């Protein structure tokens, strides 16, 4: 009886001031294609200028 | 003897501290997203039963 | 100290492929299969028409 | 009286061409951010989303 | 037999260093699937025949 | 059959025609995936503004997203009692399954 796929949000600290971000930021990252070193450098430059 | 007024130096550095904070913003942002963070991607195996 | 080696950009090679087709079957009109693939595959499909 | 569809989306004003954001289709489409580098850009890409 | 003595000579005195002149970092989406699996990161510009 | 195309890049033009003909003359159910599109609803009146072809839907580049409009037509006044009839009409060829 197989597994599945979920996320934790790091709620198992119950300790405030940490774990500010949530689940959704990972979904956006995985949604992204893939970024190479020179592509990231280009992307930083474009948003800056 | 000439005493330099404190106005020309206090505001001088105040604007330099502004450029750095506004220049380092993009790469601290786009870098942040591709890190995920505050997640784990786990899996749960059912010990039979229900 | 002494000048020695010379530098190129794209290397040559000693052994290469050579093809000889005959007509009656050949179709020299279509050279396309995709977009960003027609530059990564063919000539690897234009030497094997 | 006699309106077919009344839908909601991103504002055409707040996010304007002054910040690169362009949305004529209903999808927020920017012109350049992450792109193939050595190769020239495309006329239309899904990466522009 | 004299011709082979010219081929063997040409390879013997061959001193060529290889600088990286041309490349492309293709966007992961446009290249479909079979070709995606094949290539790692960047390729050159003059991909030969295989 | 119930077909399911995943790689719509390697197929030859003849295979696509066979696929796009067997749906018409044998009631085949075919499917595409790599196609990406942005859909927007269209009012009944006035009609369509842009029409694509069933041959271009098989040759479109992997990462190039085109828009194909879908007709609403929920509110449309029906014809009067006295008017000429019809003879074996409209056939529709494409369907979204997102939804």
Q: Cβ distance F42 to F69 under 8 Å?
A: yes
Strand, coil or helix: what is A28? helix
Beta strands (DSSP E) in F33-82 are: 41-42, 70-71
F31/F5 Cα distance (integer angstroms): 6
F62 touches chain C (CB under 8 A): yes
Distance from the Cα of E17 to chain D's closest Cα (Å) equals 23
Q: CB count, 10 Å around CB of E27?
A: 23
E13/D47 Cα distance (integer angstroms): 49
Q: Which are the contacts of D39, defined by CB distance < 8 A and separation ≥ 6? A: C36, C39, E24, E25, E26
* Strand F70-71 relative to strand C6-8, pairing: unpaired
**Mutation site for A-interface testing, chosen from D20, D32, D34 by largest number of A Cβ within 10 Å:** D34
Integer angstrom CA distances of residue B45 from A2, B8, D46: 6, 67, 37
Reference E27, options A32, B19, B4; nearest CA is A32
Residue A18 φ then ψ, to 5°: -120, 175
First to last CA, chain E: 31
- The sign of the dihedral angle between the CA atoms of E29, B33, A41, A38 is negative
- At D13, list the tokens: 């004003």
**Mutation site for D-interface testing, chosen from A35, A37, A42 by largest number of D Cβ within 10 Å:** A42
F9 touches chain E (CB under 8 A): yes
C12/B17 Cα distance (integer angstroms): 54
Q: Cβ distance D12 to D29 under 8 Å?
A: no
F43/F38 Cα distance (integer angstroms): 17
Tell how many helices (H) and how many strands (E) occur in chain B: 2, 0
Q: Cβ distance B37 to A25 under 8 Å?
A: yes
Reported structure resolution in angstroms: 4.1
D19/D30 Cα distance (integer angstroms): 9
Q: Please give the method by which this entry was determined.
A: cryo-EM
Touch between chain A and chain D (3+ CB pairs, < 8 Å)?
yes
Q: CB count, 10 Å around CB of D8?
A: 5
* C7·E35 Cβ contact <8 A: no
Q: CB count, 10 Å around CB of C35?
A: 17
C36 touches chain D (CB under 8 A): yes
Residues F23-32: contacts with CB under 8 Å, at least 24 apart: F23/F93, F28/F1, F28/F3, F29/F1, F29/F2, F29/F3, F30/F3, F30/F5, F31/F2, F31/F3, F31/F4, F31/F5, F32/F5, F32/F8, F32/F57
Host H or E run for residue A40: helix A37-48
D31 Cα distance to chain centroid: 8
Residues of chain F numbered 37-96 and touching chain E (CB < 8 Å): 61-63
Burial of F68 (0-12, 13-18, 19+ CB in 10 A): middle
Touch between chain F and chain D (3+ CB pairs, < 8 Å)?
yes
Residue F70 bridge partners (DSSP): F41
Q: Which are the contacts of E36, defined by CB distance < 8 A and separation ≥ 6? A: E28
Give buried/exposed letters for F27-43 (b at 16+ CB in 10 A, else e).
eeeeeeebeebeeeebe
C–D CB contacts, 8 A cutoff, strictly below: 3
E chain contacts of residue D42, beta-carbon cutoff 8 Å: 30
E chain contacts of residue A39, beta-carbon cutoff 8 Å: 25
* Strand C6-8 relative to strand E16-18, pairing: parallel
* B27·A21 Cβ contact <8 A: no
- At B14, list the tokens: 């105040």
A chain contacts of residue E25, beta-carbon cutoff 8 Å: 36, 38-39
CA geometry: angle at F15 spanning C40 and F6, to 5°? 60
Q: Cβ distance C36 to D39 under 8 Å?
A: yes
E36 touches chain C (CB under 8 A): no
- At A8, list the tokens: 């934790």
């Amino acid at each position: 009886r197989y597994h599945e796929s979920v996320l934790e949000i790091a709620d198992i600290f119950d300790q405030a001031d940490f774990i500010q971000t949530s689940d959704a930021v990972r979904q956006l990252r995985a949604l992204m294609p893939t970024l190479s070193t020179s592509q990231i450098r280009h992307a930083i430059e474009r948003i800056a200028q | 003897i000439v005493y330099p007024d404190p106005s020309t130096t206090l505001s001088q550095s105040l604007s330099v501290a502004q450029v750095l904070s506004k220049l380092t913003l993009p790469d601290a942002f786009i870098n942040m997203i591709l890190s995920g963070g505050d997640s784990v991607v786990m899996r749960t195996y059912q010990t039979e039963a229900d | 100290l002494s000048d020695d080696f010379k530098q190129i950009s794209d290397p040559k090679g000693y052994l290469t492929y050579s093809v000889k087709y005959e007509d009656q079957f050949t179709k020299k009109d279509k050279l396309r299969a995709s977009e960003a693939d027609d530059r990564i595959v063919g000539p690897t499909v234009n030497l094997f028409k | 009286y006699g309106a077919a569809v009344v839908n909601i989306d991103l504002n055409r004003d707040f996010f304007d061409t002054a910040t690169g954001i362009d949305l004529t289709k209903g999808i927020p489409l920017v012109q350049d951010l992450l792109v193939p580098i050595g190769v020239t850009a495309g006329a239309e890409q899904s990466a522009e989303y | 037999v004299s011709g082979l003595l010219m081929v063997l000579f040409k390879v013997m005195t061959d001193n060529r260093l290889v600088i990286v002149g041309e490349t492309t970092t293709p966007m992961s989406n446009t290249l479909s699937t079979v070709v995606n699996n094949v290539l790692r990161t960047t390729y050159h510009n003059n991909v030969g025949v295989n | 059959v119930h077909m399911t195309i995943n790689e719509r890049a390697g197929m030859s033009k003849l295979v696509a025609d066979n696929i796009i003909a067997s749906v018409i003359k044998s009631n085949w159910v075919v499917d595409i995936h790599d196609i990406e599109y942005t859909a927007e609803v269209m009012t009944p009146s006035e009609g369509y503004t842009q029409h694509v072809d069933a041959e271009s839907i098989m040759t479109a580049p992997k990462g190039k997203l085109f828009h194909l409009q879908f007709m609403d037509g929920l509110l449309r006044p029906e014809p009067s009692a006295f008017d000429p009839p019809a003879s074996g009409e409209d056939m529709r060829l494409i369907y979204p399954l997102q939804p």
